[PDB]
């Protein structure tokens, strides 16, 4: 067959993954361009939610030294590849979990519907990567929300999970932190209430 | 016009297979006695047509559509996808690649094939496309089956599509068959083995491509095409 | 020595290789655009031409599955290589002989004259590549003129033909069909009479 | 009735496939987390079905007819046969042979496939066929076509026919697959793969068979089937 | 040391496992004559019972695509090999769970005593075998009846089984389906409640 | 009457001996220039003569006694045995075997034979045999000596015994030529060189049988011989 | 694939072919029973022929050292395997062409009409198998009559034959010879009129 070159193959981020991928999580000095939590800036268009969660091991034990990368669609189902912190919305982001901090944080707006390649519509997601210590090559995840249950079961990529009780994990619910619109998120790596991770 | 700017590389007739190749029984009958006369490339040899201005069916190229009397081919559904390019390894763009096969049982839609294999309704066998400027061509067509011949008693021909390339003379014109991977039958076909040289045979097999394959969905063949090497006139009448 | 990339190896036409690469003879429904013996249209200049002509085997019998391709010059002797079917004269065109129709046919004007790559003249020729069953790597041949036997004699590639006996099976007969100019060339592939054929 | 005069050679199973094997994804929920429990064998085990009387339909075996709604299955016809032996070597005759498999386009008759190839009207795609004496069978299909399949994002089976194989007793009761030979996708499926040794592997893959094809009608593969070894009791309660 | 010829290796049944083996499970035309649920006739000697049960995964979820084969004494404890059709009783049988019944069913009577190969009796049971995709070697287990706790303490087999506590997953328990004598096996391939599985 | 139940296994002209061997001059003139034609097997092909009801001589398999004027011939007492299978390695029972051969010198008992060796006035050099039910043949005969014949200025041949097997059919009919274990001549001899394969040429060899041999008597050499492979038919004409 | 055992390879049958097989046209004394020329004794059933040719070599000289076998079915299209010398007609026989004798001679009777595999029947023909020196392998022929013109127009066999001027090599002529039909057929190894040879 043909064979191509090879990928380079992933090693683990390390429990050090803070000073270099989110310096302030970390506590070391941050350079002048950062790529953070702060994926809408106040005055984006949409629903303006806050994203929060913690990151479970087998044990059921806190994960306090994860880091996590986010990608999204803006509430027009657009994804915006040009990353510039003088934007509005950037679809992308990064966020982690820390001694001092055991839940991450998101502030972000509610990504709009999106087409798959047969054109039939997905419902409102963000595409999460997991990367920690113990974790050798990233665990990617998708992040849907309970107050879209009719697009919930109508999405391609749900209804390729076989068993209705993993696309539960997957399903962050609703809540409410000093006003503000907020979804929990708590992901599972291993045992019972395991996310459902994905390979493309 | 045309112009004569270019010479190509001396075909190694050795490599390509010979005339008279006797296992091959049609071959006795079909090959000079005589020795080839050569003559100096002119003009006449050097050039060859352009088929850039052709109108293309917008379904040329796939054979699962180009046929369509209201539904879709029975078979193992395949992309066949290469580069054309010269011995110099410089790609051949805006060059007629066609080409012409099988069902998946083996039959051919023509007359005078009386295989017992099925006609599919939903399949005709005949694809073109002409190369784009890195000398890329694809075609999606099903797997075509082999088929038994009157040659020997109990001949069979490999899986095979027939190709045919224009490239940029009537000195590069050719036209050969391409054979898939892994098929227990090469080593066995006449034709096949009209070529002496194994490495010779190698470049006919089409592999696996895995990366080109569409997901759930179809497979991929890879088969490059390597077309007489074209250099520039040198020191010529001084 | 240098060694470059060693050329695809050539193998025979086969049988079928009317339905993909002469379909109205094959019987089956043609495409909108096919490449055919029509080489000129009507208001073409030049001596308007019929050729036709017979295939022969080795034992005087006719090959009834062969493919032809030829490349001429136009009546001013120069290569028209920009293919359409809008053009009053194309330099290509295919035939073929089939079952139904045991001698092939090509409307075409006279050709010019070229000259070679030494600036000699070469007499009103025509190209001519025979592919078939049987035909492991076809055969290349050249279609000369009888009422052109002042320019034959002259003829540079004609005259590396050793012996004047085997040059004369490349002379076409001047005949006439259905009150029409028409010049007779046939092919013996193999034995008494046999054509020559050429290595470039 | 059956009696207990048959002992069986005990199963290596590390030959054999394990229970889990995580490239095959189901096996991880489907496989058990604790030891198989080692018991003697009695009468419960050492006893099965014998299949002689059941009525098989004369076109059981052929699966070219054994659909027909009105002509042929489109796809390279071939003969599936060859020998039911045990690990000693002896032939193991009347036994039950079951087989399904897919059409030349990957497509599976059951209203779970939603392939995009289509269904061949005219195939059916189950076989079933009783050994004769010598232990051989015999089933005339036409090769499936490799199918994807949701496990990895680029998973192709390689063209298999699933097999069923009765034997003696419950004990030597056997479903494995046939693959074909020089299939490029042999290597690279992970339901292949599941097997650790690569001599096992070749255990499985069906040779063309040039000796057992028909001139100008189809071809033939051989594919061997050895079940666990027989042999009588000796020196049991001493 | 002495090597015969290897066993040909063992590969899952599949997802479609039912086309072959199970053709009115998988909705497709059956032939003539086919191996099935129905064991007993009617008119068959011994206590008439009818068996259900379902397949769990390791996550708890139900096989909707397994394949079960039974072998088991008649109610005088003799093994019927000799499979037709037109006989009141056969040891033989199959079953399986499909998508449109997640309960696989068996219509056969109570199995009668069966000694082991030391002569001493096993309590009545059913051998059965588990097929599915996900499953490499299919999967040896026994059906043990629960009104014969007598027998079951004295079982050769069962007790075989180091732990009491999973001896108790191989036994059925009795219940009542539509004013019929019925019995409950439910199989747990994985986790919590094991079914204790054969090698032989 | 004979029926068309069996079907044989095609011939392998690449491992035969082709028509066309110049080195053996006399081939140039009787070699067919033209294509052989295939025609597929009917009753005409296989069936064949069955020759166990033909009246055997009680010496016609001993040319030690079969020519008897009044003594034993000069030479090394052999005995030549051996079976005849087919390719599946099936004994080929009841068939006809017949050989002939020159004496210890090289002469041959024909009248265009004016080699200078004289003739032995008790060898013939005939021979034939009908196999057991095992297949098995055996000849009591003296071990043939090598002889010059006009092809090249110095062309000898090796100590050789013609074969001739009937088998099953007229498919199956063969005429070789037996060559002695070790003999320098082997691979010198135009006629053996018309063999391409050097493996083929292997089989020809008859090998030293010490097993077989009679102490203080006669030698003994082993020539196994293989006929086309013969099966059943199965899924003719559907 | 599958490889079986090789079949012993053929070699010629050499210039005195005639001592092991054809005693008689040697010159060296017979046995009690010989396999010979005389396939029908003067009592059998059918059209009683005579059937003499000579062979030629490539050069258009005759082939003095010529071995033939020959196979036909009998009047009533049967194939007669129990070869006895008792039997009125039997189906096989044996000829040659020596030094004295430049003619082959068979003497049988016309055979009656078989049925190929698919049940067409076939013309009436007798397959020859010739042997001689400087033939490495044996050649097989067929031999049709001329009287027989519809049927062998109809034939399957003779039908496989491409060309209609090649079908009549195999086509016998009829004469007669003191009384007696015969009917002469010669072959030709090589060259100008070669005769078809088979492969089966
Ligand atoms: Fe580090
Ligand atoms: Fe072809
Ligand atoms: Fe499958
Ligand atoms: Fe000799």
Request: with cysteine.
């Amino acid at each position: 067959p043909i064979e191509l070159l090879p990928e380079t193959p992933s090693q683990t981020a390390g429990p050090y993954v803070h000073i270099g991928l989110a310096l302030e999580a970390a506590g070391n000095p941050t350079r002048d361009q950062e790529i953070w939590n702060r994926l809408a800036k106040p005055d984006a268009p949409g629903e303006h939610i806050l994203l929060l969660g913690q990151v479970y091991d087998g044990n059921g034990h806190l994960v306090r030294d994860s880091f996590l990368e986010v990608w999204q669609a803006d509430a027009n189902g657009e994804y915006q590849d040009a990353y510039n912190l003088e934007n509005a919305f950037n679809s992308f982001g990064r966020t982690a979990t820390t001694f001092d901090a055991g839940e991450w944080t998101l502030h972000t707006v509610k990504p709009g519907v999106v087409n798959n390649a047969a054109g039939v519509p997905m419902a409102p997601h963000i595409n999460i990567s997991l990367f920690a210590r113990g974790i050798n090559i990233h665990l990617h995840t998708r992040l849907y929300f309970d107050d879209e249950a009719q697009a919930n079961a109508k999405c391609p990529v749900l209804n390729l999970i076989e068993q209705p009780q993993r696309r539960e994990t997957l399903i962050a619910k609703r809540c409410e932190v000093d006003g503000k619109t907020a979804y929990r998120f708590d992901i599972r790596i291993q045992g019972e209430g395991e996310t459902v991770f994905f390979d493309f | 016009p045309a112009q004569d700017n270019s010479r190509f590389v001396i075909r190694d007739r050795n490599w390509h297979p010979k005339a008279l190749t006797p296992d091959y029984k049609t071959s006795i009958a079909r090959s000079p006695r005589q020795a080839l006369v050569s003559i100096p490339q002119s003009i006449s040899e050097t050039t060859g047509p352009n088929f850039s201005h052709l109108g293309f069916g917008a379904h040329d190229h796939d054979l699962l559509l180009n046929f369509n009397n209201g539904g879709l081919p029975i078979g193992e559904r395949i992309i066949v996808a290469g580069r054309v390019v010269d011995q110099y390894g410089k790609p051949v763009p805006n060059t007629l690649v066609e080409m012409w096969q099988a069902n998946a049982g083996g039959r051919c839609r023509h007359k005078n094939d009386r295989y017992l294999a099925p006609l599919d309704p939903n399949f005709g066998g005949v694809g073109r496309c002409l190369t784009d400027s890195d000398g890329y061509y694809s075609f999606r067509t099903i797997k075509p089956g082999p088929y038994p011949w009157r040659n020997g008693p109990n001949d069979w021909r490999p899986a095979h599509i027939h190709f045919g390339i224009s490239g940029p003379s009537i000195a590069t014109k050719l036209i050969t068959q391409l054979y898939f991977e892994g098929d227990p039958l090469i080593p066995m076909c006449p034709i096949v083995k009209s070529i002496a040289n194994p490495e010779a045979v190698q470049q006919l097999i089409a592999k696996l491509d895995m990366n080109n394959a569409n997901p759930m969905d179809c497979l991929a063949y890879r088969f490059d095409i390597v077309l007489r090497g074209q250099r520039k006139t040198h020191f010529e009448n001084c």
